[PDB]
């Protein structure tokens, strides 16, 4: 949490003050103290527009969308009505001539309700500028009430009274209290059956001590809740979850109780948050927190375990005395009053902004500063001043950019500063953009510009500056594009896949899969893809032989996926949901042929975004603007290797025996100092050709004979030969039979089943390879035979 303002008027000095947040759309933040003006702010404390008073500001209130704010005043008949479409102020006499004590709009249906001093009431419909007064509603003052969502309006007064109304005034019932209402609000009990969505009831605080219930349909049963009187005073209570209520009291102690049918009343949890003060709570459901304020501090908790404790902030001894807490809707902004009458606000919530290139991370820091740094190579974090609030973000080798709506801005990221480049603005709306090199590609309306981000005339190619896809004029829309150090690449509605080689400026291939493709996100060469279908199905696609691979497993919940950045693991990527991180291999080269695999599952926490994978190591963007590293549950052999010993050098050395990494897997070995463990490397050398390494691990492990052998065999170059004499090493004779069938010289699958004494094999080969050599052979398999008898 981060302060973003303080609003500190010389007029507002000594009084406390009242605000509100713009509601469903918070933007606007409304502002009133001692100088008779309401004051409009912009989530960055700068003023917007203003509203002069005759008198003090008694309420105000926005309307359901966020599109007016309603204001009344001391001495005056006119409410005041200012939009936020047109930033105008408008006047609205309410044909009473009272002074107005209550104001509150309808949650649902455009209506306005005023009170007034003598217990008069208006209804204003301002969609159809209809007027509605009732005379003698109250006796007295009206205090409080509320709206609930079939638009009735309950009302308390100063004559210990209640009325609840229709949206034409009427009343539907009218009740009498022991002591004076206040804080109305509505709500729906959860019963059992699902059948009920009428708001049937209503909460009050009476006298600032207790705590009261009217059931609509029931309401010859009020239910009184009184509460200890070492907590004092009722200073605030919400409704929060599925039927519950939290109190807050005035001597620092709050308290949820359940309303839940048979339970009404009965303590859930209590808490001392504050010593001698609790001024004010406020409760988001958007983040699940609540906000507390007293003391001179503000103390902030989950609604899944109040016992935690998510932040706490001191304020500095200028701000003796808290006044009330509000948060924007959205749950991103907090507000805080102070007694004496400042307002501060806090960033509760960072939009999760942030794009990767190779090593290289861009990530949004605050709503006006995005961070580039490079993790792996360890150069220092470079901070960028941005001139918008972005909604995208992307990153390349030497540039950031940024954007919003139709526009974007480019900056260098030099050793010694951050320099902005240009702004540029695109034919539609930026679904998002993708750097690389020192080109730039953004998507909008269906289509794909690439263009410089840095050009001069020296040499200029007029048609390489900028170029629009489909090049071809072709009917598809793109739905998804990535850009790497040599292609441009892209997938479409039609459910075609796209390359565009860079260095020629010409297309390089195209491949066409049933559905339309959806996402894309190609290895750091572009030599790989992965794509995800209209179906949420995962694809790995390899453009060098046209073919396509099922990636298994793969849940529909997938938002993106990334390559691993880490030279040796090629064939690595992950891919990510809201909850967990999939790590896949594709093997390109196996005996089974080509093929996905599904390596393992890592949990993420919450409402972190993956930027970038780095050898096992995934670095995310959290909700606070910093980043994090996870290591994935794949990779828990990379640690202090020495006190597991084998317990985590086996899996690594499997992992690095599949990676072909026997540089890496001979230390290991030598690590382990086990001879299963050199047997494993040498079958591996043996199964991945390597004869060179495997003559090496013989010669350690000492086996003299394979040594000598594998030394004869060095110089074979044919594939299939080599092959065939290594699978005789492994003893597999099948295989290297039809590799030596396969080869230049079939003749030594004859041979082979002759040394092994396979009479009835070698005879069947030489029948087809070398008919001369039949008669030698059956006198040999003839003396075996007389042998056996």
């Given at each position: 949490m981060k302060r973003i303002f303080s609003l500190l008027e010389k007029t507002w000095?000594?009084?406390?003050?009242?605000?509100?947040?713009?509601?469903?759309?918070?933007?606007?933040?409304?502002?009133?103290?001692?100088?008779?003006?309401?004051?409009?702010?912009?989530?960055?404390?700068?003023?917007?527009?203003?509203?002069?008073?005759?008198?003090?500001?008694?309420?105000?209130?926005?309307?359901?969308?966020?599109?007016?704010?309603?204001?009344?005043?001391?001495?005056?008949?006119?409410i005041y009505l200012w939009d936020a479409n047109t930033n105008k102020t408008s006047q609205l006499d309410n044909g009473m001539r009272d002074q107005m004590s209550f104001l509150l709009w309808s949650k649902v249906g455009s209506f306005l309700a005023v009170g007034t001093v003598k217990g008069n009431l208006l209804i204003?419909?301002?969609?159809?500028?209809?007027?509605?007064?009732?005379?003698?509603?109250?006796?007295?003052?009206?205090?409080?009430?509320?709206?609930?969502?079939?638009?009735?309006?309950?009302?308390?007064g100063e004559d210990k009274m209640i009325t609840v109304s229709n949206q034409e005034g009427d009343t539907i019932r009218q009740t009498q209290v022991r002591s004076e209402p206040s804080n109305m609000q509505f709500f729906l009990m959860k019963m059992d059956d699902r059948t009920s969505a009428a708001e049937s009831m209503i909460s009050v605080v009476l006298g600032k001590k207790t705590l009261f219930f009217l059931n609509l349909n029931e309401p010859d049963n009020p239910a009184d809740l009184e509460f200890q009187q070492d907590f004092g005073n009722i200073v605030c209570y919400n409704?929060?979850?599925?039927?519950?209520?939290?109190?807050?009291?005035?001597?620092?102690?709050?308290?949820?109780?359940?309303?839940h049918t048979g339970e009404l009343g009965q303590e859930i949890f209590q808490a001392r948050n504050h010593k001698d003060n609790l001024t004010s709570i406020a409760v988001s459901q958007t983040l699940n927190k609540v906000a507390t304020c007293g003391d001179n501090c503000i103390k902030i908790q989950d609604l899944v375990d109040l016992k935690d404790m998510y932040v706490i902030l001191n304020l500095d001894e200028e701000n003796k005395g808290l006044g009330t807490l509000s948060w924007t809707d959205d749950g991103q902004l907090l507000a805080l009053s102070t007694q004496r009458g400042s307002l501060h606000v806090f960033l509760t919530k960072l939009p999760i902004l942030g794009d990767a290139c190779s090593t290289r991370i861009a990530y949004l820091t605050s709503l006006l500063e995005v961070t580039v740094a490079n993790p792996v190579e360890g150069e220092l974090p470079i901070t960028v001043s941005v001139d918008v609030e972005p909604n995208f973000v992307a990153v390349g080798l030497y540039h950031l950019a940024v954007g919003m709506n139709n526009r974007a801005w480019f900056y260098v990221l030099g050793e010694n500063a951050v320099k902005k480049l240009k702004d540029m603005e695109y034919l539609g709306t930026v679904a998002s953009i993708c750097l690389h090199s020192d080109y730039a590609a953004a998507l909008f309306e269906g289509k794909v510009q690439l263009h410089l981000i840095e050009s001069e005339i020296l040499d200029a190619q007029e048609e390489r500056e900028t170029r629009l896809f489909?090049?071809?004029?072709?009917?598809?829309?793109?739905?998804?594009?990535?850009?790497?150090?040599?292609?441009?690449?892209?997938?479409?509605?039609?459910?075609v896949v796209q390359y565009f080689y860079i260095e020629d400026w010409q297309f390089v291939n195209d491949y066409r899969h049933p559905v339309s493709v959806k996402k894309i996100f190609p290895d750091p060469n572009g030599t790989r893809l992965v794509f995800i279908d209209e179906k949420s199905d995962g694809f790995v696609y390899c453009p060098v032989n046209d073919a396509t691979y099922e990636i298994p497993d793969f849940s529909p919940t997938i938002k993106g996926v990334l390559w691993e950045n880490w030279p040796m693991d090629k064939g690595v990527f992950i891919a990510?949901?809201?909850?967990?991180?999939?790590?896949?291999?594709?093997?390109?080269?196996?005996?089974?042929?080509?093929?996905?695999?599904?390596?393992?599952?890592?949990?993420?926490?919450?409402?972190?975004?993956?930027?970038l994978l780095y050898n096992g190591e995934l670095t995310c963007q959290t909700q606070s603007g910093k980043v994090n590293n996870i290591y994935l549950s794949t990779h828990g052999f990379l640690s202090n290797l020495k006190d597991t010993g084998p317990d985590e050098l086996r899996p690594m050395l499997a992992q690095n025996l599949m990676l072909k990494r026997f540089s890496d897997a001979w230390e290991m070995c030598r690590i382990l100092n086990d001879e299963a463990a050199w047997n494993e490397l040498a079958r591996a050398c043996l199964h991945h050709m390597e004869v060179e390494f495997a003559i090496r691990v013989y010669r350690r492990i000492g086996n003299?004979?394979?040594?000598?052998?594998?030394?004869?065999?060095?110089?074979?170059?044919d594939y299939n030969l080599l092959a065939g004499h290594l699978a005789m090493f492994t003893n597999d004779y099948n295989l290297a039979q039809d590799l030596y069938l396969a080869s230049s010289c079939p003749i030594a699958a004859l041979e082979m089943r002759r040394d092994l004494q396979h009479w009835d094999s070698a005879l069947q080969l030489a029948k087809h390879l070398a008919p001369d050599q039949i008669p030698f052979i059956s006198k040999e398999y003839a003396i075996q035979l007389e042998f056996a008898g």
């Open positions: 000095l000594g009084a406390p003050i009242q605000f509100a947040w713009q509601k469903t759309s918070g933007n606007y933040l409304a502002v009133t103290g001692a100088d008779y003006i309401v004051k409009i702010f912009d989530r960055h404390g700068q003023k917007r527009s203003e509203i002069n008073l005759p008198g003090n500001c008694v309420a105000m209130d926005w309307d359901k969308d966020g599109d007016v704010l309603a204001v009344i005043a001391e001495k005056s008949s006119c204003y419909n301002h969609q159809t500028s209809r007027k509605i007064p009732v005379l003698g509603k109250h006796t007295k003052r009206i205090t409080c009430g509320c709206w609930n969502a079939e638009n009735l309006l309950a009302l308390g409704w929060y979850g599925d039927g519950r209520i939290m109190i807050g009291f005035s001597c620092g102690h709050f308290v949820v109780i359940s309303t489909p090049a071809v004029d072709d009917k598809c829309r793109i739905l998804c594009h990535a850009l790497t150090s040599d292609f441009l690449i892209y997938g479409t509605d039609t459910g990510y949901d809201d909850d967990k991180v999939y790590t896949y291999v594709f093997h390109k080269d196996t005996i089974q042929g080509a093929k996905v695999i599904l390596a393992g599952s890592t949990k993420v926490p919450f409402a972190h975004k993956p930027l003299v004979g394979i040594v000598m052998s594998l030394e004869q065999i060095k110089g074979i170059e």
